[PDB]
Each structure stands twice: as structure tokens, then as C-alpha cells.
From a paper:
In our efforts to identify an optimal membrane system, we observed that the cytosolic region of myoferlin (residues 1–1997) formed stable complexes with large MSP2N2 (membrane scaffold protein 2 N2)-based lipid nanodiscs, comprising anionic phospholipids and chosen to accommodate all interacting domains. We further stabilized the myoferlin-nanodisc complexes through glutaraldehyde cross-linking and imaged four different protein-lipid samples, which were assembled on membranes containing PS (Phosphatidylserine) alone or combined PS and PI(4,5)P2 (Phosphatidylinositol-4,5-bisphosphate). In the nanodisc-bound structure, the cytosolic region of myoferlin engages the lipid surface primarily through the C2B-C2G, C2C, the inner DysF, and C2F-C2G domains, establishing a total of four membrane anchoring points. The local resolution of the myoferlin map enabled accurate modelling of three bound Ca2+ ions and a recruited PS molecule, revealing an intricate membrane recognition mechanism. Intriguingly, the modelled PS headgroup (C and EV1B), originating from the lipid nanodisc, binds at the interface between the L3 and the L4 loops of C2C in all membrane-bound myoferlin structures. Besides establishing new interdomains contacts, the rearranged C2G simultaneously engages the lipid membrane with its Ca2+-binding loops and β-hairpin subdomain, inserting into the bilayer in the vicinity of C2B and C2F, respectively. Interestingly, our structures show that C2G binds more tightly phosphoinositide-containing bilayers, possibly because of additional interactions between its polybasic patch and exposed PI(4,5)P2 headgroups, as previously suggested and/or observed in other C2 domain structures.
Ferlins are ancient membrane proteins with a unique architecture, and play central roles in crucial processes that involve Ca2+-dependent vesicle fusion. Ferlins, such as dysferlin (FER1L1), myoferlin (FER1L3), and otoferlin (FER1L2), form an ancient group of C2 domain Ca2+-sensing proteins present in almost all eukaryotic lineages. The top arch of the ferlin ring, composed of the C2C-C2D region, is rigid and exhibits only little variability across the observed functional states. In contrast, the N-terminal C2B and the C-terminal C2F-C2G domains cycle between alternative conformations and, in response to Ca2+, close the ferlin ring, promoting tight interaction with the target membrane.
Residue numbers in the entry: 174 to 383, 390 to 467, 493 to 1029, 1047 to 1095, 1126 to 1406, 1447 to 1984
Write the structure that this text describes.
Amino acid sequence: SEAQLARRLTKVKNSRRMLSNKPQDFQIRVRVIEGRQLSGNNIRPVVKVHVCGQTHRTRIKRGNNPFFDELFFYNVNMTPSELMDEIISIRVYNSHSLRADCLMGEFKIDVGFVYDEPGHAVMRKWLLLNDPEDTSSGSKGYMKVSMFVLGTGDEPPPERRDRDNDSDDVESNLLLPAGIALRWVTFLLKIYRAEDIPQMDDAFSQTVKEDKKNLVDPFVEVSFAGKKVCTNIIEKNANPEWNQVVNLQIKFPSVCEKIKLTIYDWDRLTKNDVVGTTYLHLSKIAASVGFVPTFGPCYLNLYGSPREYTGFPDPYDELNTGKGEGVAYRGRILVELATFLEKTPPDKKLEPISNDDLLVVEKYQRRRKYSLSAVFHSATMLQDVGEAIQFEVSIGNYGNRFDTTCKPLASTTQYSRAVFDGNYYYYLPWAHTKPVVTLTSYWEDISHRLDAVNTLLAMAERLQTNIEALKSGIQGKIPANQLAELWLKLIDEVIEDTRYTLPLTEGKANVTVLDTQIRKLRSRSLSQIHEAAVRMRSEATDVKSTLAEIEDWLDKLMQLTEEPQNSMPDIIIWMIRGEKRLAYARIPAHQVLYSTSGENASGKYCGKTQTIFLKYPQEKNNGPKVPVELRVNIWLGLSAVEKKFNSFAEGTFTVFAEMYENQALMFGKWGTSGLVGRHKFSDVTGKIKLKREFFLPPKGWEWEGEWIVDPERSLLTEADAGHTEFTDEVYQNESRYPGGDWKPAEDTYTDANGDKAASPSELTCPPGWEWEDDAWSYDINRAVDEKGWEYGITIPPDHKPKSWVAAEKMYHTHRRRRLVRKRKKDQEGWEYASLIGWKFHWKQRSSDTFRRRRWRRKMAPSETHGAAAIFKLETPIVSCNFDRVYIYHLRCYVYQARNLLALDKDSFSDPYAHICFLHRSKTTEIIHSTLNPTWDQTIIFDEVEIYGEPQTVLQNPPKVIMELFDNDQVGKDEFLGRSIFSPVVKLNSEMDITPKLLWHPVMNGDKACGDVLVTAELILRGKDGSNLPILPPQRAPNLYMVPQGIRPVVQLTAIEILAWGLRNMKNFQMASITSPSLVVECGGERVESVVIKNLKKTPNFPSSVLFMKVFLPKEELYMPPLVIKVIDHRQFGRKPVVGQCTIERLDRFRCDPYAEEEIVDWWSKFYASSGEHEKCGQYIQKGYSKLKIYNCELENVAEFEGLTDFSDTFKLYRGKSDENEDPSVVGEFKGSFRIYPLPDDPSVPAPPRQFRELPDSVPQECTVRIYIVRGLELQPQDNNGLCDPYIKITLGKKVIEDRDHYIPNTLNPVFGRMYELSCYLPQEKDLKISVYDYDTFTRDEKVGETIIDLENRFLSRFGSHCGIPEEYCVSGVNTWRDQLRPTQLLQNVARFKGFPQPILSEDGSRIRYGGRDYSLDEFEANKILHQHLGAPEERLALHILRTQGLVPEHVETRTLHSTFQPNISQGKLQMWVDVFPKSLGPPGPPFNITPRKAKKYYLRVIIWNTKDVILDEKSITGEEMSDIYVKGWVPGNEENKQKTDVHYRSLDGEGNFNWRFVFPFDYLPAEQLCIVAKKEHFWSIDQTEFRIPPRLIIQIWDNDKFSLDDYLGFLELDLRHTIIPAKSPEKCRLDMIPDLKAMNPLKAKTASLFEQKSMKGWWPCYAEKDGARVMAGKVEMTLEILNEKEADERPAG
Ligand SMILES: CCCCCC(=O)OC[C@H](COP(=O)(O)OC[C@H](N)C(=O)O)OC(=O)CCCCC
Ligand SMILES: CCCCCC(=O)OC[C@H](COP(=O)(O)OC[C@H](N)C(=O)O)OC(=O)CCCCC
Ligand SMILES: [Ca+2]
Ligand SMILES: [Ca+2]
Ligand SMILES: [Ca+2]
Ligand SMILES: [Ca+2]
Ligand SMILES: [Ca+2]
Ligand SMILES: [Ca+2]
Ligand SMILES: [Ca+2]
Ligand SMILES: [Ca+2]
Ligand SMILES: [Ca+2]
Ligand SMILES: [Ca+2]
């Protein structure tokens, strides 16, 4: 049971792991087939099915063994995880005329289990019908169902009837087998307590008392399997203590996997607010030896909205519900799960935790002190200026800057001003003085988990690095000795890694049961991987076959790193602009946690600088604007081992003592008097008195230097020290009153942050610099109007605006204009202001009557702990000073890009690139009117300054960020995407390996909008740049091309374009595309086809072959995309672009240029080839034709390549993209390509042209015959659950509607109709076969629609225009329907394939074809021939043609599609299409696919005698005696009921009848099914066809004159499986006919009543009373079946 539950959970995890979307569309098909052995006697059964709220109900049936074969559809749209938690409910009722319907049985199974089966469906299985209030009594019957789940792109499996599936429900064909137990499984989710729940109520209830930290009333709600259990509400407690078990329960086959714990703040007057949501995954805490789900006692961290309480609705409240990752810590909850395989009482759904468990849980919550450090290296790529930027580090609630704890946390950096990098971006100028953030937090020591997680992650990343080394080895075609050395290095590293012993879970308080189970599972997996590695090292030498096992090892290692008990909360770094939270980044705490067990047990970025991109608080990932690229060196660890921080510490940590001094101006002289309300000798505010003697060094610190003047030195920073080019910016300002007129502001010119600056006329270039532009100009490339102005508002007390918009409004009090142009190549220590405590600036003005100097003293660590003293600062400012700088030199080789978005109206863009690396940025050129630019540009950043040792740069390089932009001449430039990649760091000359261009993806939002071929290198610059390589050549001034060793090596290459034709050109502007032309551009070269004069008259290009010679790269990776444009030619010489496509996948185009028998009809063929009429039957004994049946489309058969192998189809696009998706499809270019390298020697002759033989490009008229066989499982379009389908075919301008020949009331219609049309290919190539619902009083609802490219049937290279049969036949029903004889088709494919034309022998027995001579005696060995066979030479030619891989005579199954459900099957349509071109003459006779009728039979029953009949149900006469008379009817024919004469006054149960019963019933021998058709009711508009198995009901009744007619027993005989009777009534007994429960009962002998004609014997009638079978009375019968002519030959009367 434990292993069964574990296998169930792992199966549902593996089956649900690919679905993550929040909405998804699904369809559930629930078919009920046959109920069997149902409880009760004389019952009247009906079935209701309830799926996901919707419900349906079968029509009413008869007897204890009903048959339905009725299908229901349930179309739902919800989360995939929600749908697997939903349930199917099959309920069986007994209807009544005057009462409500009573219940006997029920079955329930979730949608997840029927999704977990392969094919996403369980087919024709049996259910155990269980009474819900009487489940101890066992099964009260069985129910055969077949249920399907279809997702997007999924299809149902096909069906076969005689597939070991007819009957035999006993220990066979069950949905739930009897080997498993249907017991209850309970999970005891003990919920102990919670901590750090934020303020979620108003503070005005507390502050008028004159307890702000406890303003929440939390209770945890457990959502599991649709049920919700809420705990008690702890009023006014941010750290509640519930101590309550939640007893979740499931029936075993219907598991739910996702436990949802949601803490809610209870509100008396309003709705409950969401604190946070965490999930306990049952399959992640269980494994399949295996173990049941066990978890805890462990804290689960909650994440969601920021903790800062506002009375307003929270804009990030969706993060509290678990949607989105969460941006702030919302508390954590201590839970424990324990699985018991028992039925807990339902009254104990909520109960208190026992007191002994409360003492055990104390060892799982002991705290340990932790010290966290973060050295902020660089912050760059800032789009924002104004205010100031401060980074806050927090883990849990520790370090929360807005929290009202009294401790000064020092968890924030200082406020910094963004500085322009000269090109596009901004950066904080930290330089050699990095900010340092230190904080102290207390968490459980769970290092025994995170050490194993970190070591397994180190194993996984080493294995992934070696895997990528092997991939680059096999892709670069390296020598095999180096590949074997890399493989042996991989295997040796795996062997050395997986000998690692896991940390011992002994003697530690925080060890759980899940810790022991996970440790055992990890040790077993590591030992298995180690033994497989030792086996593989000596077993095999081929690295290609072994590589699939290495990926399995990496996937197994990825599964080992999962830790559900990671109670360490994430370190969240918040950028704060002004006082508002702006952007967040979440680093997992295990990624930076330090371990004393080694470097592998420590985190990947523990004590190492890492690049994190902060995100806006509801971004799935980075969008059009990144907030900041932040590089931070985070070291987390225990405070007891904080002395180990010195090895990870780079630079010297320095703290400062800070002090201010103030003076005022009296009588024209400065003096300390006049300070009204402020001290002489004080802080920055002036309200707190300090001294230089007050500040003293703490424990572990000493003074360095002396108390000195520090007037904020280096504030006039040199932002352009290492720059060869720069762009200066001065922001003109202008102010007005609201509603007034504009005038220049008092700060008429500022910098980007708002601090005042010089006028454009005042400033000059510095020495060593000169202007590139002669005058300033405003920037239109912003959020500004036509004159370069953005507009803002001022609210007091803020002097200047903080937000700006692009348009002028009357409430705007300010406006700002950015002026840019480019460039090439006091000492006393006091600051002055007009007011006391004001903003003191550099020099004294006329009104500055106050002054103030800033003052500092340096302080350095003293004791042996060194850099660990920053954790002992228990707040002054902590910084990290680097004593030296390392100069580097970065070169980015931006070669080209492909498949970019179209962001202009002319379906192209003008892409350029902003290449950014740390505090440096440069711009590539703009390539106009392309989506596949080739910049061919080397971007050189000379003399970039990176601090820290070069080894830390080599291990973790800063990222190079590639922001692509569509340039627009007006307005702001639009965003194309962002590519982040690392450069190749070179610290010396001996590792000078040439960098390799790679196709990094261009990330626009969550989808990949193209790729860019780009690489970078970062060379440690030596003395005077001597070790730097040579500068690249220049094709323009300051424009380097990508150098020869890094550029793809080009060779002369031919591109052949089969410009066949254009299809479905939608209208451009006000007119249709009448005069198009094709332009094919690749590699900078372009070719143009001839102009089609009229596309309507000629949809194909006259010159269908184009040729071009482009220098293309030898490497298949570096192949540029194939650009196609279509140019319409119009009046006034206008040539617009009316469509374009990009084909980046070109290796498909690579090629080597030098390389009882009178019933026989078509339905006999169909039933012999697709069904189970007769296994090895009479038809295949004659050896006639067999059809092929495809379960999918003919274009989805992989043998024929989708019928595009003549010419493929590429969709054209136009206009701007549809929110980063594809643009509007304005047509389809049809053609193919052949790319092959040309010889570089002109004396060598050219390779032959690959498009050798082409068909006629003029339009051809074709006779198209669409034979539609039948529909299967159509979506219902009526209120009764059925449909009235017909066929509507649209072919160009001709529409055939078969509405007058619809089929009434079926979901499996048998159409059997051929529709012959004429059309002109390829103008009318789009054949559209649609199914519509006949409706008398309403409009017709469309079932589905499928599209056939008839040009892909005609011009296909595999002969799909007519499927060739296996038999050349000239007469009868299998007559050759193709136009061409098999000799003509054989010589056609011979002229095709480069083969010689085949020669005919004189006697027709030999055909020589392609170097092989074929004989008719080869194929006709032991083959039966008949009179309808044709010529022997055509027979042999047809036998040869089937070995050529052509399309056989087939019935494809086309999926019906609809906009109601865009990728879900609305039904299936078995059919096929023959296309016959009229240039090849008339075709043969069409196949008569008209559906056969049901042959009428009469079932003849003789009622000889009866024996042992139960006594009569009493009446007024009241005597103890028996009444025997026999009723008889066939189900479906209850209007033809007949009865015998009543044998009254029986004394021993015997009655002599000699009666007869003649029941007319229709029959299909092929389907083995009876046919009955009737109207259901009075308002039934048309007749419904019902297909049921033929069966006979024979009942014993007991008539009374003085009372109602009464019933005794029933007997049922299947006409296909008639049970062989006993020859004597003594041998006839109860239960010789099968009883179906268990324990292998007697299988009765069966014989067919259709095959064996007549037999005589005895059969028992029986009933079920009180759950047990009762012998109701035997009856002697003779059963035989007559047909019509046998009935006229010998009538019975
Ligand atoms: C005098 C106070 C009466 C308060 C009467 C009262 O019931 O107020 C309820 C509302 C909302 O309070 P919640 O705790 O639901 O907010 C939950 C929150 N949106 C969240 O999601 O975090 O309070 C206000 O609007 C603030 C009024 C301030 C009035 C000064
Ligand atoms: C109450 C009077 C207006 C009723 C307007 C209206 O919507 O009628 C729809 C119904 C059902 O329409 P269908 O049978 O095509 O089922 C379609 C299926 N449910 C589906 O869509 O899948 O029509 C009638 O009952 C027939 C008489 C109509 C007389 C107007
Ligand atoms: Ca509240
Ligand atoms: Ca509350
Ligand atoms: Ca509320
Ligand atoms: Ca644009
Ligand atoms: Ca543009
Ligand atoms: Ca309808
Ligand atoms: Ca209808
Ligand atoms: Ca309708
Ligand atoms: Ca009776
Ligand atoms: Ca009677």
C-alpha cells in the first residue's frame, strides 16, 4: 500500500509536470457502454454522469444488463492543476413513473488518473459500482466506461472491439484492479505556529488608547482535494500558536497532490485579507525502498506583497495568493505532515495537537545566530534620474528598513546619485569605495540539508560543464583522442564526485523523518550513479551512445538537489528610490550560505560577486526596461564561524566616525552664535548634540589618522576619465502657474538629477576634449512632444517634479527639455546656505547667511578577527576600500541578428544595439528596413575599471547586455529585446584562444523574439596596452569590422530558389496585389524574379527558377537567415512591400548536388481492413483488396513528408507585430530551396541545377472527387446531446451544401457519399470540408472544419492524387479508378527519379526497372487469382509501384477543428480525396461507397416446457400454488412484446406451453450489431438510429385476475455468445450461467447463434433477491435464427 501510494504520486508527478499555464482549454469525453450484473430484480436502469459541474443523463433502458453506447462531452477551461483535482461522478439510478429515482451504485475517480494513462485516456474498462451508504456490502454491479481527456494538440487513441475486451470483467479489463485496496489514506497536517506575520489591520484601533506589531488576526486555511479546513482564529497576534491537526482524507485512487496552506487575516466587518500562500507538494516529499509523504516539523516561508500596511487596496495583492513568485517575506508557518493508511473518524477533521508532540517540536525551532554581509560592487543600467538610490538587504523580517523595531539595522547602503555613462545609461559611482551592508538574523541551523544541496549542485554544475564540453567537442568535429580525453575526464569527475558521503543526520536536533528518507534516497541514487560510472568506464568506448546516460545522470542529480524543507528564507535586495520601494531581487539563502564542511558544501556565490538583475514587483521577467544590473558580493554564514569571512573578504573594510559643525553670519563675520534651535557642535540635523570625544572605537576597532575636515570630497567626479567619446546633457527647465503662461525657471539649466548646472553657452570642453556637434539640440528620442518637452507637476513640500509625461496639460506647473551634443577625444571646507539647516552648497551667495562643514575621522579594524569586525558594530557607515584598480579592455563582436520583431508599418524595423558592460555603454549603427541586420561591428570599450582580484573577474565575469531597439525617426525608439551573455576573460597572453560567436537569444518579455550572433572578450590590460591584440580594420571612421579569426569563414555558395507561386495574397491598402514579384535576399546579395502581370490569371511565376551566388559561412551554425519579400508594382512607379518572411532553418534545404459472397462492395474492403468482422475472414481467403487506414491526416503521415516535398509553404507577414507575436498573415509564398557550395575554381564546371524536372506552371483544371466515409465522435450541437450532421464543402467559388441529405441524431454518422467537383488549381487549392448541424428552427452550428491543400495532392512527389490499390482490377466493384495505367505511372516515376524508362517484355512477365528485373512470379507465389484481374503487365507494374513508397489506396482520418476550441478535436472525419487533372484524360468509375442496409432477420424461439417455478405472488384467492407464463422480447423492440397462455394451478412448478416467438430485428453481420430505429417521443422531429448487441429477454411471470401482474425471474441470452444448454432439466442448475464477482468463477461455454443454427436444451431463469441469486425456474427452449428467404421457405406462423 505504501509502495502503491508512492508509485501513484510519482506517476501523477511525471504526468503533470509539463503543464504550468494559468488558463488552459480541455475536453472530456465520457462514454458509457454497458451495465452488467446490476443489483435488484425487474429494475429499470439509467445513468447520470457529472463532470466538473456539468451533467448529462442516458435514455431509459431495460433489464439488469443495460446497453447504452452513449457519449457525453464536457468542455471546460481552467488551470491544468485544477482539472486533475476535479472528479468524475458516475451514478446509476432506477427511475420510477410516480417517484424520484432511487440509487444502487456509484463510482468516483479524478480526472488526474484518467489523464495519467498513456494516450491520456483509459479505454473500455470496468467500474465497481458501490453503494455509498452501504460500501461494506461490496460491489452491487459493474459499469463499462471509456473516458478520454484531450489537451491542446492531443488526440484520442483508436478503438478495436475484438481486442480481448468483449465481456470478461472478472479480474480482467478493470479500471481499478482487485489487487489494490480501495482504502482511505489520511494525512495529519499538524499546524503548530506562525511567526513574523505583517500588519494587516488598521492601526487606529490601537493608537487612540495611547501594540502596533500585533495588528493581525490570523488563521490558516488548508485547501486539499476541493475541501477547505480552517483553523481557529488567534485574535491580535503576529506570532500565533494554533497547535491543531488537520485531518485531510482521500479515497486511494483519487489522490490530490497540492496542499495549499493560506494564512488569512480575519476581519470582522470586511473580507478576509490574504497574508500569504505556500504549497506542500506530496510527490516532492515522497518517493518510490520508498516512503510515504512525510514532512516537517519545518518552517515554510510565505512570499507576496510588501509588508508596509496601507488602508488602500494593495496593488500587489495577487502575489499573496501564490500567483507570481512574491517580492517580500510574509512570515513563515511551522507544519508537519504524517501519512497514515487508515480511516480516521470524520468527526476528527480538526483536533488539538497532543501535549507530547509539543515537547518534540521544541528541538526543531532552536535558533542560531547568523551574520550576513553584502559588498555592493556596481549598480548600472539605470534608466532613472532624480531622487537617490539606496539598496536594502533583508532576510526574513530582519533588515526591514520600514519596520518599526527600535534597533538601527544598518541594512542599507547610502543614497547615491546616478551618473551618466556618456552614451545611454546611468550608474552609481561607487568606484574604489563599495558600500557594505551588514545585518544579523536568527534561523534554525538546517546546514545538514543545505550542505548536501550545495554539494549536489556543485556535482550537477561540474557535470553540466563537462557535458557542454562534450557537446562542443562533437559539434566542432575535434579529433577523437581529445573527445575520448574529455569523456574520460567527465567519467573520472563523476566517479570522484559521487563517492561523497552525505552529512550524518545523527546527533542533530533539526533532523526530521523526511531528512532520513531523503538522505537514504540520495545515498542510493549516488551509489547507483557511481556504480554505473565504474561500469561505463570499463564497458564502452563510444561517447555517442554513452552520452544519453550522462543526461540521465544530470537529470537524476537535478532531482536530488530539491529540498522541500529549506526553511532558510531568501535574501531580498530592494532598490529604493526616494523613500519608495522600486525593484527587488531574490537570492536563495543556500546559494550564499557558508559551510565548514568545505567549498562544495558552501554556496555557489558564497563570498563571490554575482550578477543579479532586479525586477519590478509584478514582472514575470525583465521587460522593456531593466531597473538595475547589480553586482553584489554576498556572504551568509553562522556568527560562530564569522572569523572565516576573512578568506572571502577582498579589500579593507573601513568604518567612519561622522560629525558636523555649524556657524552663522553676524555683523559680517562668521561665528558659532546665531544658531537658533541648533547646537554649535552637532549632527546633520542640528538637533542632536554630539562631540568628537563621544565617538569611540568599539570592540575590535582602532582609530586611523586624526579628526579632519571632510567637505564631501570627490563630489565633482570625473565621469569621463577612460572615455574616447562622450555625450553631455543639460536639462533646460521652465515653470508656470497652473493655467498661466510659461517663463524660464529659477533653475533654468540643471543636470539629470535636478541639481543646478551651467547654461549651454557657459560650459566648454575640458582640455583633451573637443566638440563633435557645433551646437546643442533637443532630444526627440524620449517621452516628449514635438518640441522636446516633457511635463510635470509640483506638490508641496516637494520643490521639483518627480514624474513627467509626454503631453502638455493645464495642471502642469513645470516642463523639462533634454539638450545633448557629443564630443570626441571652498578649500576652507565649508558649505553655505541661506537658511539654517538648509541645503548647503559649494560657495557663498549674496543671501547665504549660514555655513556648515562636514567632518570625519577614519577607523580601521584592530584585532586578529580582521574583516570579521564589521559584524561587531553593535550605526556608522561601513565601506570597502580597494587599494588598487585593474584595467581591462572589452571587445564585443556584434556580427548579425535574425528573426527580430517588426515594429514599423512597412513590416520591417531599423534595428540598432546598445552594448553595455558595467559603467560603460556604446551604440552600434542603424541598419534600415530589415528584420535580419548585419551590423558587422566591433564595439570596443578601452580602459574599463573593474575592482577586485582578476581571478574573481575570471570566475564571475560581469555580463554584457545587448538591448536591441527599432529606430524611429519620430517618437521614442521601440524595444526589440535583450540578450545577456558573458565575455571570455583573458588574464594573460598564454590562454589567447580565439572567441567563438554564439546565437544568444533575444529576450523580449517571456518569449524569444529572435537571436543575435555575438561574442565578447575581456582582456586584462597590461602596461600601455601592449598585450592587447591588433585593432580591427575600419570600413568607416570609428567603425571596426569583426576581425578575420572571429568572423564566419565564407565560401562561394549557390542558392536555388524555386519561385513557384504565391497563394492567398490578402489586399494591401485599397487594392488587391495584382502585379507581384519575388525578392530573395541572403548574405547581402539579392535576386529578383520576373513580375507576374496578373496574379488572378496566372498565380505562378513564369521563370520558376532563380539563381544567386552568395558568400555563405562554411559552418552550418553561422548560416544567415533567408529573407523573402514580395513587391507589388502599382501606378506612379510605386513598389511597396506587401509581405515578408524569414527562414532561419536552412539545413533542410542543404543537398549534395552530385548525389454469401454477393454482398461484396467497398464496405467489404473497409470492414475487412479496419474492423473485426471476421479474423482471417472469408474476404481475405479470396484475396481481394485491403485499404490502408491512417489514424491521422495524410499530411501527418511521416512516410510522405507532409506532401510539401515538391515545394514547401512559408507564411508571409505584414505590419507591426501583434504584441511581440507574429504579425498579420497576408499570404503564403510557395516554393523550396537548394543550398549547395559552389566550386571556387572557375575552370571546374558548375554543379547541375537541382530543380531538374518541373511540372507545367500554368493553371490546370482538375476533377476532384471527395469520398467521405463516416464521422467519428463528433462534438454535439443539440440540446439532446446528439447532432444532425451533414457535409458542406467550399472549394474556391463553388459551394456544395448537403443539408437536404443530413443524417439525423448521431455522433457517429455513416455518410458514404461522394461529391464530385471541378476547380482550377492552384487558384482554388484550398479545399474546405466542414460538418454542420441541421436545425429546423435555429441557425446551423458548425461542428468542425479541415483544410486540404489540393495542390499538395496534385503536385506532390509521392502520387497522393490517387491512392494505388494492391490489385489491378478492371471489372466489378474494385475497378481501377485512376486515369493512368500502372505502366504509365511506373514510367512517370522512372522519368522522375533519374531512372531509365522501363522496358516491357513481349509476354509481359518481366519489367526491368532501375537496374533490377522484377517478375510477376515473385509476387504471385501462393496467391489466389480471380476473374476480375486485369492485364498481367499492369499487375506487375502496380506491384512494383507499391515498393516505391507511393501513397496507397487509403482512408485518412482528418481532425475537425473549430474556433470554439482552437487546438482540440471537435470530431474526426474518415474520408479521402482523389484529384484528377483533365490533361490526363477522364478517370475511371467512382467507388460506390454507399452504406449497406441492415439485413432483416427473424429470431425464432420455441417455449417447450418449464420446471421448478417459484410460487405465485398472492391475491384474493390466497392459496399456495404457482402460475407460469412466459414473456419474451428483444431490447429495443419492447413494442413487439408477446406472451404465452397462462398455465394456472401448477402444483410442482411445471408448465407445458409448446409456444412460439418470432421477433423481427435488423442486423449488420459486419458490425455484429442489431439495428433499431424509432422516434423517442411525440415532439421528436426525426428518427434516431440505435446500435445494440442482439440479445433475447425471456421472463417468467405470474398472472392474477384479482390483482396486478407480478414478476418472478428473468433470463438473458447474447445472440453472439449463446451459452450452451444442458440436455436435461436435472443437469440444468443455478449458476451454470456465469456469476461475476471474484475468485475465478466458472466460464460457461459459448457458441454463436448466427454460426451454429439450432440446438435444444434447458436454460435457467433467475432473479437477485437480498443480494443473492435465486433459482426462479428452468425453461426448455430451442433457439435458431432465420433470414428472410428462410422465413418465406418455411414459415412458422
Ligand atoms: C477609524 C478606523 C476605522 C476602520 C473601519 C474599518 O473597518 O476599516 C476597514 C478598512 C480596510 O481595513 P482592512 O484591515 O480590511 O485593510 C486591509 C488592507 N487593505 C490590506 O490588504 O492590507 O480600513 C480603511 O479603509 C482604513 C480607514 C482609516 C481611517 C483613519
Ligand atoms: C425561447 C424561444 C427562443 C429560443 C432561442 C434559442 O436559442 O433556441 C435554441 C433552441 C435549441 O437550439 P438547437 O436545437 O439548435 O440546439 C443548439 C445547442 N444547444 C447548441 O448550441 O449546442 O432551439 C429550440 O429549442 C428550437 C425552437 C426555437 C424557436 C425560436
Ligand atoms: Ca484586515
Ligand atoms: Ca483583522
Ligand atoms: Ca479586509
Ligand atoms: Ca517603429
Ligand atoms: Ca523604425
Ligand atoms: Ca443545433
Ligand atoms: Ca440539430
Ligand atoms: Ca441551431
Ligand atoms: Ca402474483
Ligand atoms: Ca397469480
